[PDB]
Amino acid sequence: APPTLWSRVTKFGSGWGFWVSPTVFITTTHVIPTSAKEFFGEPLTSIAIHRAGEFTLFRFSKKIRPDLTGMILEEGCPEGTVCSVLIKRDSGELLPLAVRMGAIASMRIQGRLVHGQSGMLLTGANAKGMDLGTIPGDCGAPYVYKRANDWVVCGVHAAATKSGNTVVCAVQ
Amino acid sequence: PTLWSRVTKFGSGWGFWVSPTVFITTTHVIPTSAKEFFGEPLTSIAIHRAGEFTLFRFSKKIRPDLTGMILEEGCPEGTVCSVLIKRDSGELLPLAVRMGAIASMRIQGRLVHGQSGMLLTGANAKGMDLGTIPGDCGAPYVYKRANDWVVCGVHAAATKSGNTVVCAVQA
Numbered sequence: 467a468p469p470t471l472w473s474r475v476t477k478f479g480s481g482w483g484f485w486v487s488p489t490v491f492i493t494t495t496h497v498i499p500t501s502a503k504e505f506f507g508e509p510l511t512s513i514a515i516h517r518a519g520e521f522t523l524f525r526f527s528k529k530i531r532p533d534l535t536g537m538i539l540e541e542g543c544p545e546g547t548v549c550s551v552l553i554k555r556d557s558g559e560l561l562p563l564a565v566r567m568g569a570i571a572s573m574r575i576q577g578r579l580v581h582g583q584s585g586m587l588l589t590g591a592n593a594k595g596m597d598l599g600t601i602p603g604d605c606g607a608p609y610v611y612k613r614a615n616d617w618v619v620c621g622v623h624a625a626a627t628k629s630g631n632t633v634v635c636a637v638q
Numbered sequence: 639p640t641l642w643s644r645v646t647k648f649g650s651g652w653g654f655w656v657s658p659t660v661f662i663t664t665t666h667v668i669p670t671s672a673k674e675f676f677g678e679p680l681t682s683i684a685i686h687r688a689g690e691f692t693l694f695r696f697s698k699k700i701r702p703d704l705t706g707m708i709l710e711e712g713c714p715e716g717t718v719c720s721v722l723i724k725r726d727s728g729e730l731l732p733l734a735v736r737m738g739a740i741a742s743m744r745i746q747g748r749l750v751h752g753q754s755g756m757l758l759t760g761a762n763a764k765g766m767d768l769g770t771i772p773g774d775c776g777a778p779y780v781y782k783r784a785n786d787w788v789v790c791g792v793h794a795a796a797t798k799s800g801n802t803v804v805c806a807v808q809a
C-alpha cells in the first residue's frame with residue numbers, strides 16, 4: 467500500500483484512526499477515550515461528531531493534517547472485493563492483512579454485539595494469533611482497496627472472532 | 639516471540655532460521671562469491687542442497703534467542719499454508735496458499751521442481767499486497783498443526799498472472 471495511506475494511520479485511544487482529509491478523521495467508536503475533552507489541540511466544542519454504531523467520524527474546524535489530500539470514503543465495498551487492513555505492529559512494522567469482504571452482518575463476538583461489513587482473512591487456514599491475524603489493539607485500522615487508478619477507504623476495524631478468519635469492518 | 643523475526647534478508651531474496659544453528663533459503667538467491675555468512679567463515683558451515691532448496695548448518699549459535707522448529711518435506715494436499723513475505727518497503731505480507739502435488743512445473747518459461755500451490759486471493763488478484771514479486775524468493779511456507787508451527791519449504795517461483803506459486807522442499 468502506498469506511503470500516503472500508512473501516513474494517515476494514527477495511534478488513537480486504545481487503537482487507531484485514519485485521516486480521510488486534512489479536516490476528517492474516522493475511527494472505531496469503542497477505542498475513543500470516554501473522558502477526553504480535547505483532540506489534536508481542538509476542544510470538543512470545535513468538532514462535529516457523526517456516529518453510526520461502531521463507526522465514528524470527526525470533522526474539525528481547522529486543517530489538522532494540511533500535508534494530506536482528501537480521498538474517497540465509500541460505505542463499505544461490493545461483495546467479493548479483496549481489501550487490505552492497514553495494521554501497525556511492534557518496531558515500525560506494517561502488516562497489510564488481506565481480507566475478502568462479504569455481507570452486512572450482526573454478530574456476538576467475545577460477548578459484545580457488533581454490526582458492520584463482514585469479511586474473511588486470506589492469511590492462513592485459521593488467523594489465530596498475532597503473526598497471521600488481528601489483536602484487540604488493532605481496532606480502528608482502515609480497510610482499503612485498489613481500483614484501476616486509485617485507492618478507496620471503506621471502513622475501520624471493529625472486531626474479530628478468536629480461532630477464526632472472520633472480521634467486522636464498521637461502515638459509514 | 640514471533641515467526642517474523644526468523645525471516646532474514648539474504649542475497650537477492652530472504653531465508654528462515656529453523657533453529658539457532660539452521661538456516662534455509664532458495665538456492666538461486668545465494669551469493670555466488672563469499673568467504674563468510676553471518677560472521678562465520680564458510681569453512682565451518684555445512685551446506686546441503688537439493689535443487690532450489692538449500693540448508694546451512696552453522697558450528698556456533700547465530701540466533702541463540704530462538705527455539706528449534708519442525709521442518710518437513712512439504713505438506714499434505716489441501717493444507718492451507720501461509721507464505722511469510724517480508725518486503726524492503728517495510729511491509730509484512732502473510733498470504734494463504736492451498737497446497738497441491740509435488741511436480742516439475744514450467745513457470746515463466748523455466749523448469750522448477752517443488753510443491754505447487756494456489757493463492758486464496760485468486761486469479762484476479764490485483765496489486766503488490768495480494769501476490770508475490772521476484773524479490774520474495776526464500777520466504778518460508780508454514781502452517782499450525784497440534785500446538786506447533788511446521789515449516790515445509792521456501793518460495794522458489796510464481797506465474798506472471800493467475801495464482802500459482804512453487805514451494806521448494808527438502809530431499
Ligand SMILES: CCc1nnc(N)s1
Nearest residue numbers: 647724725726728729
Ligand atoms: C530488512 C529490514 C526489514 N525489516 N522488516 C521489513 N519489512 S524490511
